[PDB]
Fold this sequence. Notes:
By secondary structure, the chain is an alpha+beta fold. The chain is about 30% helix and about 25% strand. The protein has one domain: Histidine kinase-like ATPase, C-terminal domain (Heat Shock Protein 90), CATH 3.30.565. It is built from four helices and eight strands. Strand 4 and strand 5 form a beta hairpin. The chain is globular, with a radius of gyration of 16 Å. Belongs to the heat shock protein 90 family.
Amino acid sequence: HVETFAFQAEIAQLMSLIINTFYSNKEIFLRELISNSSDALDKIRYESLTDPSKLDSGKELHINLIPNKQDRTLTIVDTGIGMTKADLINNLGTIAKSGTKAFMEALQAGADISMIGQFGVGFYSAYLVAEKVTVITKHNDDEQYAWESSAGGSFTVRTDTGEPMGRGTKVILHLKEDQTEYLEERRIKEIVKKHSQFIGYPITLFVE
Ligand SMILES: COC(=O)c1c(C)n[nH]c1-c1ccno1
Ligand SMILES: COC(=O)Cc1cc(O)cc(O)c1
């Protein structure tokens, strides 16, 4: 069944900032997730170096960007370490909760949002483009989970029953009505080339 959680009020508060503040340079939302995905392919390249039985859930280490116009969705799939329940529910909430304050202190004093990454809170970047985000993730030690939040204070998590994804994180952006420009191949290739040309993992932009 579906469990409902509340955001730590600092996370809540953040998500509003992102959602309601005027900021036109939204495309950066994507290199944050690319980057994030690289950070989770790093973690598992590394661990498998000592324990190669960790790759039994999938030898192949790659990023996939998937645009779906009919759904209004860009998913960023990745074969990374993945997230456990304790991750989704309590461990991420914890780290995120410092990243948030620093990021927000650093805001008057005129840093800005394209910098949310140097603060550990990149993932929340999605909220620039996404009206609801759905994380489908699969760790080696735990069950497969779906996390979802349309923001506004609360997130859900359930055990998934979709395609068994083997090991990874899929992040399905359910884009707002006026942001469909990131559903366009020509527009996705330009951001990748601009902001993520050095990611040491195969990035595959699916066409439609
Ligand atoms: C994949 O989505 C996430 O990365 C996530 C979740 C599910 N909770 N918190 C976070 C997070 C990201 C960055 N800092 O925190
Ligand atoms: C830094 O920790 C995290 O944010 C987990 C995470 C893993 C991933 O494969 C993609 C993400 O967007 C986030």
